[model samples]
Target chain A: VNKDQIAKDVKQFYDQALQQAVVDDNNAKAVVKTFHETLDCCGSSTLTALTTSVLKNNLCPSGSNIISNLFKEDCHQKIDDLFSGK
Target chain B: NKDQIAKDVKQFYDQALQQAVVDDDANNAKAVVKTFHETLDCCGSSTLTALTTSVLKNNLCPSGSNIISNLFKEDCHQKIDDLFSG
Candidate 1:
């Protein structure tokens, strides 16, 4: 049933609600939800724990490359499409 | 990639099952959740924003701190699946 894929949930949030939000505050809520679903799908509990462990150490990615690798394919492309003019 | 994910999940579950470990406590939990959110970036969605949202709202902050429980959003399971499948 594909009941649990993080990426799928993420795409849904963007398509269904995030796109419509006028401000970042509302859009942000959708963003958070997308994260959970994406991780749940790609990686399992270990992935989750590993991630939790890393962040626990205060190790955020220095730039966008790391960000692109985790959630999207062609991360740069997606950003270009979404934030084209901005 | 799918194979890798399956392997990782299995390993995680095995360990978690064996050891009743918990990274409880406010700061620790928060860090763990944040790290989980960051990992979404590696999925390569051009933007990890979608998946990031899922973790924050669904997995981490279920209370809808900003927009989840209080904001009244629909379940994002379907949405998440599609995004990942793509």
Candidate 2:
């Protein structure tokens, strides 16, 4: 798990997801909007909050949608791969 | 392992929060969450302590228009104690 590589991949994933959402789903419009909004106020904790909220509360639809797509695209797996120390 | 994460997370948060406050931009949730996301990704989930997780889950994020200045003002020590011991 190269630190630089993990940084690059995670950033790429986040950038691409926002771009894809911008171009694709109508629901994603709100998702992107809220994503930026949450980021502005919460920093990285927004991801944790949104993910936890989605799991426990189903409260953040935009966050749930965006993060779900990222997981489906293997973003978490890639990040997790960095944990293997390879 | 978690101790390392605990150290790294607090270190990241300390400096990151300092910059936010110095800029009088504590209101910017986006920058805050982005920093957290980056650090969390960089550190990996295995590194997170229960106390760190609790703080992120319950205390760190902004609520409505109110930002978390007091936490930083106290340098996160009290919250760490409250979470770790209580």
Top-lDDT structure, candidate number: 2
lDDT of 1 by residue, A27-76 (tens): 33334334334432211222332343322222222332334435643322
TM-score of each: 0.21, 0.27
Which 10-residue window of candidate 2 chain A scores lowest in summed lDDT?
A37-46
Taking the tens digit of each residue's C-alpha lDDT, what string does model 1 give over B7-84? Answer: 333333223212212333334333333333233222111123323444433444233233322223322222223333
- lDDT (tens digit, per residue) of candidate 2 on B1-86: 22343354355445544444344464543254333533232211222332243354433332321223322233243332221222
Clashes of each: 49, 16
Task: Name the regions of candidate 1 deviating beyond 4 angstroms.
Answer: A1-86, B1-22, B25-32, B38-83
Error of 2 at A85 (Å): 24
Q: How much lDDT does candidate 2 score?
A: 0.36
